[PDB]
Amino acid sequence: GLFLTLEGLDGSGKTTQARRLAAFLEAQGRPVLLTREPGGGLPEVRSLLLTQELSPEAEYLLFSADRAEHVRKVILPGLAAGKVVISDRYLDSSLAYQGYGRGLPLPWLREVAREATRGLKPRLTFLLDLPPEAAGLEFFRRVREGYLALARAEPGRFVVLDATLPEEEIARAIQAHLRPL
Amino acid sequence: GLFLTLEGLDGSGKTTQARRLAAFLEAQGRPVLLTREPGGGLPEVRSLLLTQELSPEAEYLLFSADRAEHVRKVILPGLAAGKVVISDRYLDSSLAYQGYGRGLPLPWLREVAREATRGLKPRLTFLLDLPPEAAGLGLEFFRRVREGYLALARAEPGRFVVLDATLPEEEIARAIQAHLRPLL
Ligand SMILES: [Cl-]
Ligand SMILES: [Cl-]
Ligand SMILES: [Cs+]
Ligand SMILES: [Cs+]
Ligand SMILES: [Cs+]
Ligand SMILES: [Cs+]
Ligand SMILES: [Cs+]
Ligand SMILES: [Cs+]
């Protein structure tokens, strides 16, 4: 199997590009599982995450519970069956939003995640980099820059794309990075 | 403020004793806040934990999110106001059930907890100990939990007070009072 994720602010186009990728790979003959966070593990998490004035720790722990179930019950079984599994959002979303955005310590985030994810990391992550005003502007600037920080740190895994480019051009770039895999 | 917890199997009497402890403290003119886990932070987590079959990891993390909210929105504010806060269940429930019971690694559980709880530990925890039969194949999980609680207690004898929960309710209550009185 092959694990791929898409990341970015809401309205960055990462959702569009996840489905375009899923359809492209399917046309190459490859079995695909398209999924998303939050809700891919525990659909009821989407309710809890909207709680008024939720602490950043509680918000991250809810994302993590969802992720734990998502990895165990959906993603790992899909990879085991030889599928390309594509998730619209994964752990980097939490690192960018709860870590860089809300100020939680990244090492704690990663330690929680290590059991939650069983260490599962995608082979490639396509980050759609969107100017924060096109998404709490201060918050969104922190999240945007946090994503870029994550990408600088794991340049093997991240492919950073300009989300202001036409949808078709971004899809072609994504396809070009995959062809060799 | 003073933070106290009660622990044990469901049907151990922990809930009755949490109520009697709050009553004792009220009779001493001490402001008291009685609370509980799960659901004291995020009520929907309790609802989910009742109906959903989850991995042990996901179960723990949901309990942890509830606990994070409970600590920040209920317990710490109670303690800040100078109340004695009594929780019916706290972190030791997760360690015994999800750690000893379901098999999750205890160091990881405690690393998660460290930020979730902001390091807040109770001054005393009253463990209402009894065999699961006093609260065939289903008993093995509960035996693990029981022995897990006892393992926790013997590792922190300064914090834990272990009571024989099969004793009459008034005798247990009087034992809890006697242990608490030096925190006068
Ligand atoms: Cl999007
Ligand atoms: Cl009880
Ligand atoms: Cs890359
Ligand atoms: Cs675009
Ligand atoms: Cs916890
Ligand atoms: Cs602290
Ligand atoms: Cs003690
Ligand atoms: Cs009893």
Side-chain angles (χ1 to χ4, degrees), chain A residues 1-9 11-27 29-35 37-120 122-137 139-167 169-178 180-181, chain B residues 1-9 11-27 29 31-52 54-136 138-169 171-173 175-184:
Chain A
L2 175 61
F3 185 32
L4 304 171
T5 62
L6 287 90
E7 291 286 0
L9 298 174
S12 66
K14 96 268 182 280
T15 294
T16 296
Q17 297 299 332
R19 88 185 141 76
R20 289 185 72 133
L21 180 51
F24 167 83
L25 288 176
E26 181 190 58
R30 312 267 183 249
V32 179
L33 183 57
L34 178 62
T35 192
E37 297 185 352
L42 277 171
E44 297 85 356
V45 84
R46 297 182 61 88
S47 187
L48 286 161
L49 286 165
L50 301 174
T51 299
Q52 189 165 30
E53 293 166 13
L54 195 59
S55 68
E57 291 82 358
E59 178 185 309
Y60 176 62
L61 291 162
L62 288 172
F63 270 105
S64 195
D66 176 56
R67 189 168 296 120
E69 202 69 355
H70 193 209
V71 170
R72 278 169 184 77
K73 309 300 181 62
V74 177
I75 298 169
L76 291 169
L79 293 169
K83 304 190 185 184
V84 180
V85 180
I86 298 162
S87 191
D88 176 358
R89 300 195 179 284
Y90 190 54
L91 175 64
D92 297 305
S93 283
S94 278
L95 299 184
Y97 281 79
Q98 287 99 62
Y100 293 91
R102 296 199 67 195
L104 299 175
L106 293 177
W108 181 68
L109 301 183
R110 295 184 184 280
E111 180 61 35
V112 174
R114 268 197 287 273
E115 291 291 343
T117 66
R118 313 196 69 246
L120 178 75
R123 174 61 183 83
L124 283 176
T125 297
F126 300 98
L127 170 63
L128 285 274
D129 176 42
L130 182 75
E133 74 276 15
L137 279 204
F139 170 79
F140 291 113
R141 292 174 198 127
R142 288 198 299 275
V143 177
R144 188 248 181 164
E145 289 185 14
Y147 273 132
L148 294 174
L150 297 171
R152 280 198 299 283
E154 288 176 77
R157 182 164 67 87
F158 278 85
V159 176
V160 182
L161 301 155
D162 172 2
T164 65
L165 292 168
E167 183 182 293
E169 297 192 348
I170 298 177
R172 290 191 294 269
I174 290 175
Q175 288 164 29
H177 282 89
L178 283 171
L181 316 179
Chain B
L2 174 62
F3 182 30
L4 304 174
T5 67
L6 293 89
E7 292 289 353
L9 295 176
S12 66
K14 139 197 80 54
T15 295
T16 298
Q17 295 294 333
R19 192 194 74 218
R20 291 186 76 118
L21 178 57
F24 170 74
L25 291 162
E26 284 185 48
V32 183
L33 184 185
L34 176 63
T35 193
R36 67 171 197 176
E37 297 188 350
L42 299 169
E44 266 174 277
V45 164
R46 184 171 183 282
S47 300
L48 286 181
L49 291 173
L50 287 175
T51 54
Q52 300 284 334
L54 304 173
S55 62
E57 294 82 1
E59 188 183 302
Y60 177 61
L61 292 162
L62 282 182
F63 263 99
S64 295
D66 173 48
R67 184 170 302 120
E69 207 69 358
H70 190 210
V71 169
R72 285 172 182 67
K73 304 308 180 48
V74 180
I75 303 175
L76 290 173
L79 297 172
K83 300 180 177 185
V84 181
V85 178
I86 300 165
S87 196
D88 180 352
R89 305 195 176 285
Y90 189 57
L91 176 59
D92 299 306
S93 284
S94 283
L95 303 178
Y97 282 81
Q98 285 104 56
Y100 292 94
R102 293 202 71 189
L104 294 178
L106 290 152
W108 179 73
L109 294 180
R110 292 189 171 98
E111 286 305 311
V112 177
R114 184 182 196 263
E115 297 297 327
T117 64
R118 306 190 57 190
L120 179 66
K121 298 177 65 70
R123 176 61 180 81
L124 289 176
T125 297
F126 299 97
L127 172 60
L128 281 289
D129 179 58
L130 55 310
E133 300 94 317
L139 299 176
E140 292 162 22
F141 168 79
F142 293 109
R143 292 202 189 89
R144 292 193 298 280
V145 174
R146 184 210 182 166
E147 290 306 323
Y149 271 135
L150 290 169
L152 297 171
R154 74 175 63 91
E156 285 180 75
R159 181 167 66 93
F160 282 87
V161 176
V162 184
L163 304 156
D164 186 327
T166 67
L167 294 178
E169 177 189 325
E171 304 187 5
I172 296 164
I176 289 175
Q177 288 161 25
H179 283 97
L180 183 60
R181 277 190 182 282
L183 285 50
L184 56 87

